[PDB]
Amino acid sequence: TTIVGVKFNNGVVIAADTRSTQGPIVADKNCAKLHRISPKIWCAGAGTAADTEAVTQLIGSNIELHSLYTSREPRVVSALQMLKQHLFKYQGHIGAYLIVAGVDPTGSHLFSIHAHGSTDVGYYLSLGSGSLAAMAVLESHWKQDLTKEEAIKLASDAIQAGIWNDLGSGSNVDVCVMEIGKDAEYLRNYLTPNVREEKQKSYKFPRGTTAVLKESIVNICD
Amino acid sequence: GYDRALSIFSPDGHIFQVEYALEAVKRGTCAVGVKGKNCVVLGCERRSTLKLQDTRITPSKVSKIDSHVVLSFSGLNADSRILIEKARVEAQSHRLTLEDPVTVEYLTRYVAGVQQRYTQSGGVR
């Protein structure tokens, strides 16, 4: 997959492709790699999809429960610590490489997490199959004090690098903008440059084409 | 190493060495073979000179290649031995890869083939 996070002057924005592979075969041509942990703490994940979804969701719960217990808006450093201490506790056997981001009472925040439990802090980040293609764009384009609009571009252009140049990534782009003032806006399929061209033929069949041996009504209601 | 052309064409179209080889045959002890209706016989002159031979062991002119084929000859004795040995081997080999003994022609074609080879190869007479 291909994920990134980009800080901007009043918040943080993250994006991701939508290709889901298994071996060389594309299983899902449009899945979201973007995962809500709390309303303002979204998480982009690469690696084993069951592990990214599960560990994201598990912490999300514990954060919600905790947020209710404390009567305070959850923090991105809270989700960060809970994730690393879990992943690390597993020595890597949970295939989740995450880019956690959000806004909370202390500000906007952007971190990366690795399967083994390590964390990094940065202004621009990327993970996965496409990482390098994306990071090449990021290195070439990021500048300090980007506008929200500028970062939405930079972010999205970095995912594209991944879509095209990387075979582990493709289809469309998802984005989520966490602004400090406002609600988190989750722009799903914010870009869909890969649309299948109309086929060269309907393959609909004449009815009766298939040889049937026996038919029956199955019962559902009791 | 040594490959000089010993068997070659002389101006009138003859290969002198081969002819001179036949001359050796001309001086060989008369060998003869005639075919019957259901048999074949081979006769062989042996010089009358020495009443002092040991006839049990002195190599005999008729030789078996296999259990069903024999070879008689005339010319240089020592050369014959070399043709026989090569023949008996080809016989045992033909059985080993065809599971059936050689036809008299096949064996012959083989031996004659070897003879031919010494007329057209370097370093050999």
Partner: protein, 204 residues
Amino acid sequence: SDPSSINGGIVVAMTGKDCVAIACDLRLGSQSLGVSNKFEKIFHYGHVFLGITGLATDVTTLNEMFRYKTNLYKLKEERAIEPETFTQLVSSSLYERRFGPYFVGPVVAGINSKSGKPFIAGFDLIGCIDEAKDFIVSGTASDQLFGMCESLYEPNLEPEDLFETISQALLNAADRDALSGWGAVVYIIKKDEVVKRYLKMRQD
């Protein structure tokens, strides 16, 4: 041997107008050797349908499990479980064995009784969900089924068309897989009724 390739078989599921279809072959192998032409891989818990490919013992065990779970669900909640909710149960149940997973490739199909909208979903052995809107494949002939489903499918088919499609999709794929075949069954699922049809194919 890879346990997901021992027994063999496939499952496929699609969506058309106000309906969903779900098919499977009938083979049960012990690798090379054909063992049973009557191993259906499609089960139902109320109006929600589950197809499971992979290791035979695990398929049987999972059906037994989801029957058990969905029964206790119906008693507590006083209503049949829906596809959206079940797909979650499936996922949670599988991930609960993250480190000794059932070697399976399940598929969910059905119509939500309130929303009335058609729904399908698939997942790897560890419950990572794929909720594609068009179709879902699984089995020793996944490769082949993607090939068929991608060329043959078109949105909003009417049941008897969807039938013809998912049948032709399954059939030709099962026929390029050594470990599938030996019969096939197709369910056409709708708001009111469900129709199970058996197909006539090669047996080799």
